[model samples]
Target: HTIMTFYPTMEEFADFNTYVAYMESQGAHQAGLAKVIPPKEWKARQMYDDIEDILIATPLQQVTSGQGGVFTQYHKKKKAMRVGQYRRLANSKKYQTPPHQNFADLEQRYWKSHPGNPPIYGADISGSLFEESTKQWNLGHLGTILDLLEQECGVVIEGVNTPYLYFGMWKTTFAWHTEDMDLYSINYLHFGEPKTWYVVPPEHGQHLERLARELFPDISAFLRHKVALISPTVLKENGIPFNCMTQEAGEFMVTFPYGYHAGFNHGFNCAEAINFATPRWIDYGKMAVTFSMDPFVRIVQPESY
Candidate 1:
C-alpha cells in the first residue's frame, strides 16, 4: 500500500490535549527510556572487580599491569576464565564451547543472520513492549491528534487501526538499503544526526523483497525495535568522500507499497531517529481522541501536507 502523510491543525491540537487529560485521568503515561550496557564492558567490569578482590586476599600473587609473568597472563586471560571453567569438564565439553559463547559471538551471529533487523543485543524495550502501556499512553496520545482532525476540519480520519511505528538508531558505520513496509508511517528523529540509508516506496516492494531475499535469504524478518545506526564520521575518516542528504525534519508520504530511498550523515557521531507507528487503539479498530498538547507534532512534520 502507498504511504500517505497527514498534518493536524491547531483545532486538532486542542482536541488532542483534551484526550490526553482524559487518558492521564485514566492512568495513561509515557514510557520512560531504558538503558542496556554493552556485554564486553559488563563482563570486563565483573572480571576486573573479582580479580581485584582475589589480589587483595592473596597479596603474594597480586596481579599488576607491569609484570610479565602470571600478572600479564591474568590481564589477558581473566575474561575467558568464566567460560573455560564451564567448558572444562568432559560432560560439559559435549554441550558447551569455551569462550565461544561470549556476547561478541552472539552479537555477530544476530547481525549476520538478520541485516536490517533490530539489534536483539543491548536492547532496551521495557516500556514500549507492554500492551497496557501502548494502549494507555501511546494510543491515548495519538487519539488526541485524531480527535482534533475530525472536530476542527470535519474531516473524519480513516485508517485508525492501520498505523505502525518503525524506529531504529545507529552508533557505528553500517549501510542499510532503502526499504518499505505495508503500512503508513510517520517517521521521527529523536537524537544525533538524522541520516537515512535507504527509503523504498510501496510500489517497489516486490522488487526490493526479491532482491533482499536473494541477498539475505537466511536473515530473520526486521524487528521494529532492532533498528540500528550508521556513523558518517567513520566513513570520512577512512578516506571515503560522500555527501548524504538529511533534514533537520521532514515528512515523507508515498502511495507506492514501498519506496526506494537511502541517506547518510556526513560527519562523526551521527544518529537517525524514527517514530513510525500509530496508536494501538487505532490498530485495534477503535476511534480515540486525545486531550494532551505537545510541540513534537509540528517539530517532526509539516502542518500543511
Candidate 2:
C-alpha cells in the first residue's frame, strides 16, 4: 500500500548528504519518509487537547490577530475553500473532548451549515506551532537536511512564516502541487491516523504540465495561474507514473523542490509541515514567476504561482 521509501529511525540519517545519498541511491529525486524523533513540542499535544494546547501550540504572533493564516477546505473533486471557525471552537472551554473529536465535530458542522456540499480538507494552521517552543522546534524538526544546510546557508528556514500545523479529518486533502518558489517542505505526523501521499518526480512534473496543456485544457488554464489540483487516480488512468505511501505516526515525509505531490487524510490526525529554500530554489522561483506571466493569470502571479 505504501510506495515511498522509509527510514526506520530519525537519527539513522543524521545529515544533509545522508538524505541526499539515500534519495540518489533510490534512482529518483523525489521525496522520502522515515521514523523521526519529534521534539516534545513537535508532538501532538495541541492536536489531542486543543483546549489548553492551541494557545500553547499557536505561534505567539497569531494570538493577537486571530487571522494570521488560513486553513483551506476542499468541496469538489478539485476545489478548495478556506475555513476560520476552528479558532473559536479551539478556544471554547465547552469542548473538553479530544482534539480530533472536537475538531471533527466542528468540521462536520462547518460543512453541514455551508450552502454547498463543501467537503473539508480541515484546518492548515501553519502558524500553530507554539512560539514558546520555537527554539526546541527549531533545533530538530523532523530530522531533515534543512538543519545541516541551515548553518551553511546562513539561514534558518523555520521562522514566523514557515511551519504549518495541519488538523485533518476523513476527506481533508492537499491537492497535487509543488511547493511555492520550488522550495522544499517536510511533514511529520505528530500523532493519529496515517496519511497517504502521491508523489511524482520532477522530470514527470513537466509531463503533467504537458498533459494539462495538451489533454486537459481546463487544468492548463488554471495552471497558468496556480498549482494544479490533480488526483492520483486520474493520473494512473492516464498512464502517468507516481508512487503512493501511507505515513504513520512518528514518521516524517520530505518533499523535494519541483517534486509534485498530494494526499488525503485517512482519519482524524494532526501534523506539522514546514517549507524551506536552498540555493537552487531561486531558479525554480524564477521559473514560477516566468511561467505565471500568461496574461490570463496577472492577478494570481504573486503567490502560489
Candidate 3:
C-alpha cells in the first residue's frame, strides 16, 4: 500500500508544530511514514550543488545483494572513503547492475533474483554540512514538538537532537530498524535522486520482529543491528500491514515512534535526518527501557531527563 502524503498550504504549513498535530489527528502516523511536500512557492535554497568536491570522509559499508536483497552484513572491512570518490565509483559502470532505469525496475529485479548478485558501497556520515541557519525548515532549526524537550530540559544531543547528513548512492540501504529510544525521525532529501521507503506501523512491530527472527535466525538482534532487509511482499504474506513510498528532492519523510522503517537511495543523493520527540514519546521512551527486546543492550532515554 502507499503512504499518505500532504501538500500543505502556505498558511497551514507556517507552523510546523500545528501542521504535525493536524496530521496526527488525521491518522497520518498510522502507516508509520508520511511524506510532506511544501507549498509550491516554498523553494528551499539549493546549496551543496558541488558535493563532488566535498572532501569529508566516513566509513563506507559494503552491501551484498543476496537472497534477501541487499543486506548490511559483510566482512569487517570498514573502509574510510571521501564523499566525492564514492559518488564517482557509484556512477561508474563498475557497480551498476544492468540497465534497470527507474527505482521500480530495481525493486522488481531486487526481489525477483534469488541470490541478489553484485554488491554496492554506501556511507552514513553524521555531521553538519553547513553552519546552522535560522530557516525554520533547516534540519538544525526545525522546532517540532521536540522544542518542548529543549525548553524543559535544556539538553541537546549532537546526533539525536541535531541532524545528521547521509550520503547515498545507487542501492545503498539502511536496513529495517526503529529509532533509538523509540523517538520519531524526520528525513529531508536535500538534493539528489529519489529514495524508496518501506514502513510498518508500530502496532505490528512485534510481528515484524517475529517474522525477522523466523526468516533470519543466524543474525541475532537482526533488526536492532540494522543489517537486514526483508521484502514488503514477504511481510504482507505474513499478514503484517505496511506502506511504501518514494521521497524526492525537497520532500520530508517522518517516521512515527517505534515504527519500523527501511529504505535505499535510487542514486547519488544527500539527505539529512534527526530523531525528535513529542509528549507521547515520553511513554514510549519509558517502555523502551523496561521492555527492550534486545537483552544484550539497554535502551537509554537522554531526552527523558
Each model's lDDT: 0.26, 0.49, 0.70
Q: Which stretches in model 2 have alpha-carbon errors above 4 Å?
A: 1-4, 8-22, 25-117, 128-161, 214-228, 279-286, 289-305
Question: Residue 76 lDDT in model 1?
Answer: 16
Over 60-119, each residue of candidate 3 has an lDDT whose tens digit, in order, gives: 545454464334345233556677777777678855544688777887865664334344
TM-score of each: 0.29, 0.57, 0.83
Q: Which lDDT value does model 2 have at 157?
A: 41
Per-residue lDDT for 130-227 in model 1, tens only?
13332222322444334544444454322232232222223112233332222222222222233333343333434444543443334533312122
> Tens-digit lDDT track for model 2 on 81-186?
2323433332244322224454445344332332322333444454543434433333235343234334344443443125766765544556566765565666
Q: Which ten residues in a row have the lowest lDDT in candidate 3?
A: 289-298
Reference-based TM-score, model 3: 0.83
Best by the lDDT measure: 3
Preferred candidate (TM-score higher): 1 or 3: 3
- Model 1: number of backbone collisions: 53
Cα-based lDDT at residue 4, candidate 2: 50
Whole-model lDDT for model 1 versus the true structure? 0.26
